[PDB]
């Protein structure tokens, strides 16, 4: 849940 689309 580190930001990545």
């Amino acid at each position, epitope marked *: 849940q580190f*930001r990545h*689309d």
Partner: antibody
Amino acid sequence: AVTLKESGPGILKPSQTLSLTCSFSGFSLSTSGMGVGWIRQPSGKGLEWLAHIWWDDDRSYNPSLKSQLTISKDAARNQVFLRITSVDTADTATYYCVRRAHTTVLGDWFAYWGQGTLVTVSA
Amino acid sequence: DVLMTQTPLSLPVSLGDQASISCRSSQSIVHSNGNTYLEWYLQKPGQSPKLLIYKVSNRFSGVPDRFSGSGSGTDFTLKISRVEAEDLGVYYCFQGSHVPLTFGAGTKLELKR
């Protein structure tokens, strides 16, 4: 042409507040999906991620240092800042500014790193 | 935290040798979006780290094809097909999937004598 330039105080004493600045060009932090962060390396040791900040004001921190860290930005001036309160000799390191986007097109990787700013902490 | 274990931490080679570095994660590096954000970095003495490989096996622009990355899950490898002098330095694996983002301790590619 992407550039990343870090600046800091060079030397600081334990308990003091480290303020670092990354000034960049050739991309905008207001661009959808863009982010900029900081990684550090205590001289002769390995690499430690500190914080990242996104185009939309969302932020991510290393939990070990959560109480000591603040990442912020001035997107209009092309600047990202990191603040570290209550520093100690353990925070002696080269601090790097890195670019990292959360979208595949903009670059989801640490491709661009500054040259790094050396910070020594001692009384 | 996701511990990234590199094997070996020091690797003696002669120029021309094939070279392999293992990186193992303590949990899965697969993001909920389905990508595996495993990256390999090279730091040559006195320089900042350089991206070599992202997402397990993608070579970054300008990186020589003698470098390749493979693996899946918790088990990853960097291979150099023929080590050149410019390749010597410290290799880190890195996972960008879980907070905190974490690097391996570093594997020093050094010369055999």
